[PDB]
Amino acid sequence: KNPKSDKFKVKRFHHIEFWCGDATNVARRFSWGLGMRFSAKSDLSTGNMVHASYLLTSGDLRFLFTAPYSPSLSAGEIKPTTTASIPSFDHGSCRSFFSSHGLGVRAVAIEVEDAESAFSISVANGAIPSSPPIVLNEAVTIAEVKLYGDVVLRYVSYKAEFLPGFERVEDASSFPLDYGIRRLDHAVGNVPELGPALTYVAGFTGFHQFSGLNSAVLASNDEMVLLPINEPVHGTKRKSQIQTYLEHNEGAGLQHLALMSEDIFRTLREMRKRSSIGGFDFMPSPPPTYYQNLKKRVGDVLSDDQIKECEELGILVDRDDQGTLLQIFTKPLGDRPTIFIEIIQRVGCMMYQSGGCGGFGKGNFSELFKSIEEYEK
Amino acid sequence: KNPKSDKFKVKRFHHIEFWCGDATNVARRFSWGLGMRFSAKSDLSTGNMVHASYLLTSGDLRFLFTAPYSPSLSAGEIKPTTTASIPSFDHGSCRSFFSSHGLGVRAVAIEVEDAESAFSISVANGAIPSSPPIVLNEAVTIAEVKLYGDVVLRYVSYKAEFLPGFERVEDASSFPLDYGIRRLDHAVGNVPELGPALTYVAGFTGFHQFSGLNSAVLASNDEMVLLPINEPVHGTKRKSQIQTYLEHNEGAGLQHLALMSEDIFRTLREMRKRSSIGGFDFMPSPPPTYYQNLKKRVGDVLSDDQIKECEELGILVDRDDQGTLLQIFTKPLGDRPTIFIEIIQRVGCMMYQSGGCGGFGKGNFSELFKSIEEYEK
Numbered sequence: 181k182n183p184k185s186d187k188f189k190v191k192r193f194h195h196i197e198f199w200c201g202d203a204t205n206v207a208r209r210f211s212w213g214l215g216m217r218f219s220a221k222s223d224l225s226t227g228n229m230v231h232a233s234y235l236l237t238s239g240d241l242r243f244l245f246t247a248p249y250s251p252s253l254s255a256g257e258i259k260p261t262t263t264a265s266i267p268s269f270d271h272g273s274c275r276s277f278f279s280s281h282g283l284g285v286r287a288v289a290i291e292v293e294d295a296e297s298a299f300s301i302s303v304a305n306g307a308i309p310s311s312p313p314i315v316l317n318e319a320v321t322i323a324e325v326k327l328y329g330d331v332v333l334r335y336v337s338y339k340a341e342f343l344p345g346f347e348r349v350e351d352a353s354s355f356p357l358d359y360g361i362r363r364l365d366h367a368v369g370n371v372p373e374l375g376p377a378l379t380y381v382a383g384f385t386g387f388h389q390f391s392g393l394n395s396a397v398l399a400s401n402d403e404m405v406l407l408p409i410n411e412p413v414h415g416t417k418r419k420s421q422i423q424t425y426l427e428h429n430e431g432a433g434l435q436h437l438a439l440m441s442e443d444i445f446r447t448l449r450e451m452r453k454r455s456s457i458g459g460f461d462f463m464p465s466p467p468p469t470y471y472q473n474l475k476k477r478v479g480d481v482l483s484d485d486q487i488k489e490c491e492e493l494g495i496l497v498d499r500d501d502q503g504t505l506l507q508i509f510t511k512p513l514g515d516r517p518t519i520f521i522e523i524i525q526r527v528g529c530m531m532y533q534s535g536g537c538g539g540f541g542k543g544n545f546s547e548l549f550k551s552i553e554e555y556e557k
Numbered sequence: 558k559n560p561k562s563d564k565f566k567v568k569r570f571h572h573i574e575f576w577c578g579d580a581t582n583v584a585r586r587f588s589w590g591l592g593m594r595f596s597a598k599s600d601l602s603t604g605n606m607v608h609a610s611y612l613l614t615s616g617d618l619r620f621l622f623t624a625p626y627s628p629s630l631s632a633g634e635i636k637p638t639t640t641a642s643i644p645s646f647d648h649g650s651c652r653s654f655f656s657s658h659g660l661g662v663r664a665v666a667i668e669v670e671d672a673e674s675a676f677s678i679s680v681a682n683g684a685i686p687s688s689p690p691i692v693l694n695e696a697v698t699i700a701e702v703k704l705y706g707d708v709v710l711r712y713v714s715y716k717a718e719f720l721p722g723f724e725r726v727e728d729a730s731s732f733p734l735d736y737g738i739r740r741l742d743h744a745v746g747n748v749p750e751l752g753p754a755l756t757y758v759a760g761f762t763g764f765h766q767f768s769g770l771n772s773a774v775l776a777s778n779d780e781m782v783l784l785p786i787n788e789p790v791h792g793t794k795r796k797s798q799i800q801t802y803l804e805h806n807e808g809a810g811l812q813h814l815a816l817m818s819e820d821i822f823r824t825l826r827e828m829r830k831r832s833s834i835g836g837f838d839f840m841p842s843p844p845p846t847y848y849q850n851l852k853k854r855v856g857d858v859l860s861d862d863q864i865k866e867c868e869e870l871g872i873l874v875d876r877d878d879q880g881t882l883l884q885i886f887t888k889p890l891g892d893r894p895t896i897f898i899e900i901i902q903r904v905g906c907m908m909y910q911s912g913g914c915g916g917f918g919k920g921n922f923s924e925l926f927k928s929i930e931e932y933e934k
């Protein structure tokens with residue numbers, strides 16, 4: 181049952197904004213390691229005395245990296261006169277956020293028909309306001325509400341590139357890197373209690389519901405905005421990875437971004453080539469027993485040679501009644517064992533492909549326990 | 558005149574420690590962009606609950622990158638029980654430092670015969686103490702005094718790899734990157750007033766003295782520890798780049814690290830190939846007039862083909878009475894227009910090569926003004 185109960189018209193994931201200590205170095209690392217392109221900037225060179233913000237792009241995926249300058253550069257300004265390109269920015273909030281959680285996602289940003297209506301409707305249905313609707317250069321409206329922890333859901337709407345006050349970087353400083361990543365598939369939040377977190381977000385949005393954790397997934401009408409949310413399952417054998425997150429993150433926050441790749445084989449080859457020269461490390465591979473068993477589960481979908489490629493790259497494979505999902509997980513993206521990244525590609529549900537085709541991999545919890553189980557042998 | 562008036566036995570530059578928001582991402586960026594090797598770590602995986610520290614190595618050059626974890630991980634510890642591998646570390650100091658100056662150098666570290674004697678003698682000659690002498694695992698003594706701003710001069714001495722509590726990373730996570738950089742040549746500080754800064758550092762060390770600034774250089778007995786210090790020259794046409802530093806840095810701090818390369822041509826080729834894919838940008842090239850004139854200044858030293866290579870890479874060339882210096886400068890290393898890096902190679906003063914052979918490039922201020930001067934033409 182898809183009740184399509186959204187309370188305002190949501191379109192797509194628009195961007196993810198990281199709050200940094202130093203935006204430059206995270207942006208350069210992420211660019212090289214994910215093959216994302218340096219496409220826009222707002223900083224000193226464009227007259228922003230408040231924050232440094234650098235946008236990376238791959239396909240439809242937009243990663244924004246932001247850090248505060250010294251307040252002494254903008255102590256004279258007031259909000260009416262600000263040189264900030266992003267009006268919700270605040271030195272104190274950014275410094276507090278970062279020193280509390282370390283590097284991670286401040287904003288999950290979705291495009292909507294009308295940011296102002298979306299904010300108003302959201303607040304009227306219980307959303308905590310974070311930044312009111314502000315209109316940028318008669319062209320873009322942006323507003324923010326609290327999602328979970330210090331992560332805000334940012335609404336973005338356009339009259340008719342990224343934001344006013346941002347510049348395009350010309351092709352010379354912009355190396356056309358591309359490892360095949362094309363859009364944001366879903367963003368996952370870790371929370372102390374699932375129940376209330378769900379009730380809060382589905383309450384103001386209208387989104388419907390799509391070892392060591394329970395998890396539910398909230399989705400927009402066409403199910404292209406997918407927001408899973410985890411809670412820890414306490415008391416079990418191995419410590420819950422969700423609780424580990426909450427302890428190292430200092431509370432709730434975004435756990436991982438799933439990035440869709442048009443060719444997860446090329447993406448993972450390119451990313452793995454670069455792991456140890458500035459890129460991202462991947463999580464430990466599953467035992468070969470997992471790939472032996474892959475023929476039984478997915479034989480009618482991937483050839484032996486394709487499945488062979490999966491085991492070279494450590495790619496995981498799940499499937500449900502509608503479709504089949506390929507996935508792999510990076511090790512943490514920075515100092516703390518908190519936020520990480522998933523690479524996914526989905527096979528099926530063709531009509532365009534329906535969002536979430538094949539699920540999110542919960543079968544792979546089971547397939548991995550049993551995987552080692554025989555591997556031990 | 559070299560009075561060799563050091564007050565304690567100094568050996569070599571030992572390492573440079575960056576204080577980060579996120580040590581991982583700076584360390585990965587610096588590794589790829591400078592071709593430095595991931596050689597040691599102290600962090601959660603080695604039982605440090607206090608800070609994350611990652612050591613990069615190229616030749617004798619050691620870059621250390623450190624960031625604080627959440628205090629909630631070590632709130633139970635006290636200094637006697639600390640899991641920190643670096644005893645001078647302090648969450649509050651690191652967070653304060655970084656939120657004040659942004660990414661930059663916390664510690665210029667030199668090896669000495671006896672860190673404790675060096676600290677004691679230094680304090681008795683006016684040094685401000687920052688961290689007392691602490692002995693690590695009956696093997697290493699480390700102590701810190703204030704150098705300028707929030708930059709400390711760290712003394713390091715060994716009974717007989719980097720530090721106790723650090724692990725070597727095994728060759729698999731350690732890609733043997735190498736672009737030819739071999740040791741730290743000098744570290745330069747920007748200060749509001751040169752006079753008092755000089756008097757303070759030469760006072761406690763015994764080091765002797767070797768447009769828009771005045772600058773003097775302090776040096777150890779064998780002149781292998783070189784510590785230049787700049788002050789702004791106010792009132793001139795173009796704004797002083799030193800004052801710009803002080804305003805964006807929130808006061809005094811380290812301006813640049815000069816890294817000696819055994820083959821500055823290979824280094825700069827490798828670095829430039831990577832500028833726009835995660836590496837470092839370089840400062841604007843000088844006009845060809847500069848390279849036309851190079852034959853007149855340095856014709857008896859570099860061939861036409863070698864000089865040709867210089868103009869491909871934007872390498873600058875200076876020389877004094879003793880030797881000849883090749884140099885180039887990176888754009889800032891992070892968000893703020895503060896700290897940058899110089900690549901140098903020195904020709905001459907062979908006896909081993911004497912430190913500082915050929916100077917530091919002050920002639921190149923003159924050669925560049927006159928360079929454009931005709932270039933404009």
Ligand SMILES: CC(C)=CCN1C(=O)CSc2ccc(C(=O)C3=C(O)CCCC3=O)cc21
Nearest residue numbers: 368395408421463509522540541542544545
């Ligand atoms: C990297 C770490 C520490 C854990 C991640 N992880 C694995 O390591 C191997 S199995 C695995 C299977 C699925 C997922 C996943 O993406 C998902 C959730 O689990 C909740 C529902 C929504 C959702 O998106 C993550 C997995």
Ligand SMILES: CC(C)=CCN1C(=O)CSc2ccc(C(=O)C3=C(O)CCCC3=O)cc21
Nearest residue numbers: 745772785798840886899917918919921922
């Ligand atoms: C990148 C920026 C903004 C300025 C740097 N710079 C140039 O840009 C071109 S000329 C130039 C020549 C020499 C030096 C230098 O290294 C030096 C000092 O100046 C003081 C004495 C000690 C010392 O080490 C730096 C230069």
Ligand SMILES: [Co+2]
Nearest residue numbers: 368438522540
């Ligand atoms: Co997922």
Ligand SMILES: [Co+2]
Nearest residue numbers: 745815899917
């Ligand atoms: Co220099």
